[PDB]
Amino acid sequence: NMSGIALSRLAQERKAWRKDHPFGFVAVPTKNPDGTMNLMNWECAIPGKKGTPWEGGLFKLRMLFKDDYPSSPPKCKFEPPLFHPNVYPSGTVCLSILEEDKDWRPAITIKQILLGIQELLNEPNIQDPAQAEAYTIYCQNRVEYEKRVRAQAKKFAPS
């Protein structure tokens, strides 16, 4: 419908992704009950970065687009929610590029988003806490922090 602009961009994104993407990353649209392809809801997976405490884990994330996309950024949500200073308890990611009033630009691609999030994993934004627990531990006890993360990466290790 009025979603023509969004769908059109979303199809370009899908196409470009298939064409080329980062190793280990996953990004695929969901299927409507009717076996059809729902371009407004993607299921993604981000691999923990090598040489970090996230290393080895495969973190599943859901990307939800609005009718006005790309005017607005998608909503990114970890399923299940991750322990991290910038991830709300709902699993929603707190990241400047994901905010219209902030750093979001219509030209930003899905790949960039995913890479941005991955990057965020090992480089928390202490200035913008989304959750009490992870933020406290991070500040109060780095050691315990990495410990929690490790256990986490381990819990989300792909077969």
Side-chain angles (χ1 to χ4, degrees):
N1 292 280
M2 328 289 228
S3 304
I5 293 157
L7 296 155
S8 129
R9 165 74 175 267
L10 289 170
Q12 304 303 301
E13 293 275 336
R14 172 175 149 304
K15 155 181 69 160
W17 175 265
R18 310 193 111 256
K19 198 167 165 204
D20 170 59
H21 69 259
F23 184 82
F25 285 75
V26 176
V28 81
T30 61
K31 291 312 155 213
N32 297 277
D34 65 12
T36 72
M37 161 181 286
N38 183 1
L39 289 161
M40 320 272 285
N41 186 150
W42 295 45
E43 297 189 341
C44 311
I46 300 173
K49 206 159 167 46
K50 296 180 155 211
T52 70
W54 298 82
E55 186 168 45
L58 189 63
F59 315 100
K60 162 197 164 180
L61 173 125
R62 180 161 325 257
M63 254 193 236
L64 306 155
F65 300 88
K66 286 169 60 207
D67 286 343
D68 63 355
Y69 170 83
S71 182
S72 66
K75 176 182 194 202
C76 299
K77 145 136 90 169
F78 280 112
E79 296 183 346
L82 286 201
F83 164 96
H84 185 285
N86 307 120
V87 174
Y88 290 102
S90 65
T92 296
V93 179
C94 182
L95 184 67
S96 78
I97 65 164
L98 299 181
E99 282 174 78
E100 216 159 292
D101 285 345
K102 288 171 209 186
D103 297 339
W104 169 254
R105 283 175 184 222
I108 292 164
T109 72
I110 287 184
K111 173 187 324 164
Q112 289 170 331
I113 293 174
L114 299 179
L115 299 157
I117 296 184
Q118 176 186 64
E119 161 188 81
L120 173 74
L121 301 168
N122 204 236
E123 296 167 44
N125 169 17
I126 208 135
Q127 301 264 102
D128 292 354
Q131 76 161 263
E133 182 183 29
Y135 175 82
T136 301
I137 299 173
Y138 182 85
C139 286
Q140 298 293 293
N141 193 346
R142 211 71 85 69
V143 159
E144 282 303 295
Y145 178 73
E146 317 249 303
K147 262 201 63 300
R148 261 292 260 308
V149 168
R150 295 218 158 81
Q152 180 173 243
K154 163 163 201 241
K155 181 183 195 177
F156 298 117
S159 358

